[PDB]
Amino acid sequence: GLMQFTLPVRLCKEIELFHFDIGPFENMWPGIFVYMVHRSCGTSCFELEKLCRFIMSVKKNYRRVPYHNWKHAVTVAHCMYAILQNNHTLFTDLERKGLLIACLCHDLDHRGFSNSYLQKFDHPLAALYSTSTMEQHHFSQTVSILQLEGHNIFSTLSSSEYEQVLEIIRKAIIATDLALYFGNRKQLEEMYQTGSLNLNNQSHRDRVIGLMMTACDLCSVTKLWPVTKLTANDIYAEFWAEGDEMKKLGIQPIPMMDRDKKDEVPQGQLGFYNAVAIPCYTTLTQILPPTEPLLKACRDNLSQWEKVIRGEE
Numbered sequence: 641g642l643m644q645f646t647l648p649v650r651l652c653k654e655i656e657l658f659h660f661d662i663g664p665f666e667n668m669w670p671g672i673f674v675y676m677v678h679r680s681c682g683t684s685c686f687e688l689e690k691l692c693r694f695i696m697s698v699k700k701n702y703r704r705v706p707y708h709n710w711k712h713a714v715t716v717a718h719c720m721y722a723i724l725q726n727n728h729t730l731f732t733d734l735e736r737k738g739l740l741i742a743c744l745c746h747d748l749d750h751r752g753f754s755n756s757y758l759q760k761f762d763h764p765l766a767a768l769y770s771t772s773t774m775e776q777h778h779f780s781q782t783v784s785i786l787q788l789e790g791h792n793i794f795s796t797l798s799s800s801e802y803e804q805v806l807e808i809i810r811k812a813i814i815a816t817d818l819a820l821y822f823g824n825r826k827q828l829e830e831m832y833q834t835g836s837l838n839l840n841n842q843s844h845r846d847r848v849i850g851l852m853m854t855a856c857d858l859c860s861v862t863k864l865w866p867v868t869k870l871t872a873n874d875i876y877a878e879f880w881a882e883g884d885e886m887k888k889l890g891i892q893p894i895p896m897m898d899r900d901k902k903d904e905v906p907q908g909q910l911g912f913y914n915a916v917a918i919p920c921y922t923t924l925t926q927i928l929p930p931t932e933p934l935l936k937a938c939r940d941n942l943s944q945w946e947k948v949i950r951g952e953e
């Protein structure tokens with residue numbers, strides 16, 4: 641186990657900063673993810689032979705959709721990595737493992753369509769799992785992959801270590817359901833401001849890890865303007881597709897998903913940052929101050945949307 645990964649000096653340096661873009665080179669991403677595993681957890685956390693086969697089974701099962709794809713998976717994994725490196729005493733050796741594996745599997749086998757659209761299309765998955773449909777699907781594929789002859793990266797763990805980490809990953813993936821985020825933050829809000837929040841409380845840790853997971857998923861809004869602007873495209877490319885399929889079911893889609901209502905995007909982005917991203921990072925920073933760069937960035941991008949509305953870009 642004396643193999644390290646190293647990265648070109650520029651990547652080596654930039655990868656530690658929250659706003660790091662993993663670049664257009666698909667071939668390097670798995671290096672970048674192992675790289676984060678080693679520096680974030682240690683060199684013998686996982687057997688390499690096995691991690692390299694688990695990372696590639698994962699890639700294979702993420703489809704070619706505009707946003708909900710392999711680059712997403714990895715972008716989200718780096719952001720949890722960033723979070724963990726800047727808070728390196730608040731997380732256990734099990735939670736540092738699981739959470740990065742969670743982030744890479746958090747959207748396995750996404751089709752590009754929302755839990756809304758499965759249920760109205762009457763997809764089979766919406767029969768097998770009433771709520772958090774996709775997310776429960778994604779956790780299912782994570783464990784599918786894990787039981788493939790050769791792929792069990794957690795092999796070496798004790799019974800309770802292993803049983804615990806699958807329960808960290810399960811709650812982590814399910815907390816990426818943006819439905820479930822609104823309630824979860826407002827609780828962490830009360831708890832923090834009444835000062836009853838306790839990190840030795842397992843039920844509280846969970847809520848917090850959930851907030852981390854939502855902060856990592858939305859991390860497109862914490863990048864430098866041009867990354868965030870170009871990611872927005874890939875996002876609306878999926879929304880409008882799902883909109884086209886709603887129309888085909890005889891259903892008029894919410895303006896967000898209607899491609900005939902492009903013009904009204906600058907406005908709808910505003911609502912989101914105000915209604916979701918700014919609250920999200922605001923709380924996360926009040927709980928974990930070394931994650932301020934995410935809130936500072938997010939506010940910068942809000943400001944840049946403000947400027948798109950005023951015909952200034």
Ligand SMILES: Cn1cc(-c2ccccc2)nc1/C=C/c1nc2c(cnn2C)c(=O)[nH]1
Nearest residue numbers: 858860861875895896901904905908909912
């Ligand atoms: C709430 N919302 C409303 C609209 C919207 C409404 C009318 C016309 C055009 C757009 N656009 C959004 C934002 C969408 C969104 N942006 C996101 C997400 C992740 N990254 N970003 C920027 C996400 O999950 N949702």
Ligand SMILES: [Mg+2]
Nearest residue numbers: 746747774816
């Ligand atoms: Mg998801």
Ligand SMILES: [Zn+2]
Nearest residue numbers: 712746747857
């Ligand atoms: Zn995601």
